[PDB]
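dumping this here before i forget
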Amino acid sequence: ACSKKWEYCIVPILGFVYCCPGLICGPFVCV
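structure:
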């Protein structure tokens, strides 16, 4: 599932989630 911008998403250097096309995960959220 794609994470929403002002939602929640962590990007650990081993495995991370993915936002919807257009948004990119950042500081435990998406932008």
